[PDB]
Write a protein that binds this ligand. Structure first.
Ligand SMILES: *[C@@H]1O[C@H](CO)[C@@H](O)[C@H](O)[C@H]1NC(C)=O
Ligand SMILES: *[C@@H]1O[C@H](CO)[C@@H](O)[C@H](O)[C@H]1NC(C)=O
Ligand SMILES: [Ca+2]
Ligand SMILES: [Ca+2]
Ligand SMILES: [Ca+2]
Ligand SMILES: [Ca+2]
Ligand SMILES: [Ca+2]
Ligand SMILES: [Ca+2]
Ligand SMILES: [Ca+2]
Ligand SMILES: [Ca+2]
Ligand SMILES: [Zn+2]
Ligand SMILES: [Zn+2]
Ligand SMILES: [Zn+2]
Lengths: 271, 396, 271, 396
């Protein structure tokens, strides 16, 4: 990172939309019920040809399927340069979907949390505990300077306070500056101490149906809808995919290249 | 130059003072000077023009002297004087125009037109008399190698530059820290912006700096410093440094903190004003250093607290601005300013006669290019042409 | 692609090896017999830890396994920024080793061929026909200027000249300027008309045991043996992997980034 | 300057001609000039300044005239003359040194030291006599705005620059096409290299171009042009343009083909030489365009064909050179050259007395920096100091 000096009289360059469409890849994540309703084995080819009409080279649009929001929330691996997640809306899962967005619309720096030997705390409002697995049931016992527990006994987990049960993904936020003993099913869950660095610009979430319920910020005073959080009413999935294809330029305009240099181990679908 | 100025001054005084009914006692010395000018110029042939579309004109001087035995001037005397005055004024105007459109790199202070070079001969020094105008006075001081001085109201010392520097940037341009400025003429507006409102800053303070180098030393300068930059206080879409994309700026103005304006000469602090606004005096300087701070308000009302959240997205971007206007200054070099017309005169003469671009000045006499690269040769040529323009303005 | 003007006095930068390893990744390709001899369920983990001692961040080194040279030759995909292929030497598979090395050490620009409709010819010395699949059998019938076979009958394919039998990868080089009718088992193998653009500088091949037998150029008069074609002697695979880990600095020094802009969206790892 | 030169010339002539036993007829005019100098200088106080570590020195002149009335000069005459000449020579050397260490951005052709400014008064014009040296002759021509000419053996016209241009490149730096050059003093060595040896070129020909834009116009220049550039004909490890890495150069030298040396003035072809090597004459130019070609040999013996395969790797890289030496030339401006000592003298005087860096010349009188930015102000100051240096070298 170096200072960048620019002249306000500089001329705008031509549109780079065609070049980025040519040199980038698009990943679409949709629920399995979409494929079920569409009921066509060649719909991937059809959408690829339509995207080609929109400018994307054949083979650069990758279609990925997930069973549901809860299943997809277990270590979501976003591959392409541009990722669009068609997330079905369920009034009962408002938190979970929000968490999923909170997981994929932001960059997270995470380190392992070996709870069974160590005591942990959250240093600042950017710190959270992200737990992912088949079943994440997390109980918390706040502690104090004398190392005793408040309304909890370290020797009896039954007295721990319940913050998660049977979760595929959950973001736990506790009071900062306080040590907590943790009890999570390590067999079916992995908990990580994470810091949200900032927005993840290459991931857009399109909520299919419902209303604006997403809250990607733990602060109760903010519920910001960024340009990467779209929301479309629906009755047929074919119309949903047609509107995704037709307004692909608008969707990618709302997104930007990831720009982060990572330390992780994930594959990517790039050109 | 002194002889050309003296011709112009004699002609102007003749126009002003040789009037019907005036006592000869009021013009006796002027009439003697005028007759001396006639005697000196008689029998001399001159040629002006021949550059661009400026026409070649031949000048012959064979004139009679003015009478000296009148008690009061009458109509006949005035018309007899006016014929010669008209011819001489035309000659002086053409010589000035011929000199204004020419330039040289090595010796641009010296006369370039053949007419003015001929007028620089010793025999013409008899024409020379009172050199009282500011520009001819500075010309004579320069020729004597004395300290020169030009007073400028709103000196045009800053070349036009609307620019920005991003000290913190991302491809999405949503968490931007930096500063944007306009330098134009005698005016410097600067504005430091933090999109996060210095929430993650060490002491919740973001330090902004702006250094402007003046191409010439300004002395005895009166400046007005104001705590807001109205030029960068409204929302705008700004090109990226490479022009590849455009970012959004949505200012919300907070008063600048620990404002410190330093006027430096050769890297030495001459003047320093902290938290001082209104009229200040910079006695001698060539560089301006404006250092200000964005301090996050420790206490916020619910609306102000709503403006600045803990983390992104940042929709309202904190901005602190400074305005610095040089109202008057003194410079040892010639500059275009708001009150004078020499730059306008030289540019007008060069444009009207379609003078090809020379090796000294930028095309079209553009001031931004001239002051950006204000070399000593350009200063020599500019002083010469500005002095000629001032001489011409006495008559035309 | 613009001219680059440089001064012969510009100061050398510091070593980029540390940041290169922190920002790049290493795919190591080994045969199945290597894992069989190692006889450990966690040799990947210990190799990754040793690589980390050598500088690479955890999860950056990828370990891919192939049955043998023939199977690996069937459309090999190279994922990481730096690819090292440990190829065992067999005295009876010299041409197959050479073809694999040619395919993965050079850059190729390929287009499909329709052998059942049109006749084909090779324009220049860089033009080849690469056929790969489960079983590639290619027979050729050169035609004269009257589109009539020479020493072959266009109608009868039994008279065609056999250039490949049951191969999994074969690079066919025929006389340039002659149209050839091709009989290829398209049901089990695909043939593509390719041009050699240049070297793939991100792929190194380490020949385990044997001699220098690789020939990545069809010209009889050249056997380059470039700096990206190493050879080692071995008795045990653990020694081979320890040598690869210890001298990974030299291996990566011998390689450079791919530098080719691709029109194809494939699966890669990129940190 | 002409008075200072005349003092130095009179003193040198006195030292060379006032010798024991010489006929007075050999020195009569010299004795008259010397006595005129003594009369003009008597009663005048001079001070050579304290710039840097140059000591403040005071000079008083009260000398008797050199005698007449001798048929042959004797020892007494020569001894008296030697005393006077020694004092005068010390004064002249100190004045020259004081002038050599000073500079002004504007009016830098004018005298800078107080002693030389005093000597520029009318009362010392009597001292002025024969101005025959090349530098004083050109000084007088410049003062009159006439054509100036300085003859240089091996003129130092090219600032040092060892650079390269990669027209075809890639991160591995194994298939490179481009040019590498050294421009230093009066010499240009250029070399166009192709790693593929023009295997894929349109006609097995690779075209190489090198344009060197001289910062002053050279006239009547004799130039040796040789085919090979020995500086770029041996294996090298060269930094990358940004310094990130190093690439390898393994030249094999082929003769340049279709060599084309153009000497251009103001973008107009003045001289052209095709397939010409040895001495060539460029009569008037400010730019040199060298066009050469690497032609792949149509026929190659097995050893040659082994070096140039059809495809990569390319281990022997085909290079075609060109050497261009300006043996002598004429320039209207002053330049450092191989035969003269003016630049060395000025630099030595500045370094010996620890003269602080001024606003005109680069620190240390660095010639590369000087001629890279050879501005009119720099040209005036440099001509002034070089003329003073030559005047001093007449005596010191
Ligand atoms: C940009 O678009 C204009 C408008 O057609 C075109 O002339 C130009 O070549 C394009 N490219 C650039 C680099 O300006
Ligand atoms: C490079 O290395 C040198 C010495 O090893 C060190 O002083 C310097 O800080 C390093 N970094 C840079 C950017 O030069
Ligand atoms: Ca959940
Ligand atoms: Ca409890
Ligand atoms: Ca917390
Ligand atoms: Ca919230
Ligand atoms: Ca094979
Ligand atoms: Ca046959
Ligand atoms: Ca062939
Ligand atoms: Ca070969
Ligand atoms: Zn930007
Ligand atoms: Zn010599
Ligand atoms: Zn390079």
């Amino acid at each position: 990172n170096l200072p960048i000096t620019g002249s306000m009289d500089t001329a705008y360059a031509n549109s780079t939309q065609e070049e980025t469409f040519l040199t980038s890849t698009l990943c679409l994540y949709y629920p399995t019920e979409a494929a079920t309703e569409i009921n066509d084995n060649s719909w991937k080819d059809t959408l690829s040809q339509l995207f080609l009409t929109k400018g994307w080279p054949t083979g650069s649009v990758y279609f990925k399927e997930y069973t549901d929001i809860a299943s997809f929330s277990v270590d979501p691996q976003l591959y392409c340069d541009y990722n669009v997640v068609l997330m079905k809306y369920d009034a009962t899962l408002q938190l979970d979907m929000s968490e999923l967005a909170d997981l994929i619309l932001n960059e997270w720096l995470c380190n392992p949390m070996d709870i069974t030997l160590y005591y942990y705390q959250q240093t600042d409002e950017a710190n959270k505990w992200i737990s992912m697995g088949s079943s994440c049931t997390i109980k918390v016992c706040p502690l104090n300077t004398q190392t005793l527990g408040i309304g909890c006994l370290t020797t009896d987990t039954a007295t721990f306070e319940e913050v998660a049960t049977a979760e595929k993904l959950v973001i736990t936020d506790v009071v900062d500056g306080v040590n907590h003993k943790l009890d999570v099913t390590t067999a079916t869950c992995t908990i990580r101490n994470c810091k949200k660095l900032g927005p993840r610009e290459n991931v857009a979430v399109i909520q299919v149906g419902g209303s604006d319920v997403l809250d990607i910020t733990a602060d109760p005073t903010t519920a910001p809808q960024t340009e990467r959080m779209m929301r479309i009413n629906w009755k047929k999935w074919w119309q949903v995919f047609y509107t995704v294809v037709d307004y692909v330029n608008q969707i990618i305009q709302a997104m930007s290249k990831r720009s982060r240099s990572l330390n992780s181990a994930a594959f990517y679908y790039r050109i | 130059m002194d002889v050309l100025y003296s011709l112009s001054k004699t002609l102007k005084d003749a126009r002003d003072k040789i009037v019907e009914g005036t006592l000869y006692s009021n013009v006796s010395d002027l009439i003697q000077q005028f007759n001396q000018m006639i005697i000196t110029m008689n029998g001399n042939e001159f040629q002006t023009g021949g550059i661009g579309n400026l026409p070649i004109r031949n000048w012959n001087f064979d004139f009679g002297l003015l009478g000296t035995t009148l008690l009061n001037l009458d109509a006949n005397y005035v018309e007899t004087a006016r014929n010669t005055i008209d011819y001489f004024v035309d000659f002086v105007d053409n010589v000035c125009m011929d000199e204004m459109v020419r330039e040289s790199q090595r010796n641009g202070i010296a006369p370039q037109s053949d007419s003015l070079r001929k007028l620089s001969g010793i025999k013409f020094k008899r024409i020379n008399f009172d050199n009282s105008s500011e520009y001819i006075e500075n010309w004579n001081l320069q020729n004597r190698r004395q300290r020169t001085g030009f007073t400028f109201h709103k000196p045009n010392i800053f070349p036009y530059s609307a620019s920005f520097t991003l000290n913190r940037s991302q491809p999405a341009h949503d968490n931007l820290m930096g500063t944007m400025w306009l330098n134009a003429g005698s005016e410097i507006q600067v504005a430091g912006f933090d999109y996060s409102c210095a929430i993650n800053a060490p002491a919740n303070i973001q330090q902004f700096e702006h250094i402007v180098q003046l191409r010439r030393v300004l002395t005895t300068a009166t400046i007005t410093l104001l705590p807001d930059a109205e030029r960068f206080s409204f929302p705008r879409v700004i090109n990226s440094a490479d022009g590849a994309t455009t970012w959004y700026f949505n200012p919300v103005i907070l008063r600048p903190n620990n404002v410190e304006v330093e006027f430096l000469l050769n890297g030495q602090i001459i003047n320093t004003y902290q938290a001082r606004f209104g009229t200040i005096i910079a006695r001698n300087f060539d560089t301006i250093r404006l250092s200000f701070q964005l301090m996050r308000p420790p206490n916020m009302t619910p609306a102000v607290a709503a403006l600045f959240p803990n983390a992104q997205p940042f929709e309202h971007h904190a901005t602190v601005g400074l305005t610095l206007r040089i109202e008057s200054a003194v410079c040892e070099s010639v500059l275009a300013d708001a009150s004078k017309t020499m730059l306008a005169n030289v540019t007008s003469v060069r444009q009207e006669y379609a003078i090809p671009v020379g090796p000294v000045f930028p095309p079209g006499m553009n001031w931004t290019d001239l002051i950006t690269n204000y070399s000593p040769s350009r200063e020599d040529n500019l002083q010469r042409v500005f002095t000629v323009a001032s001489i011409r303005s006495m008559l035309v």
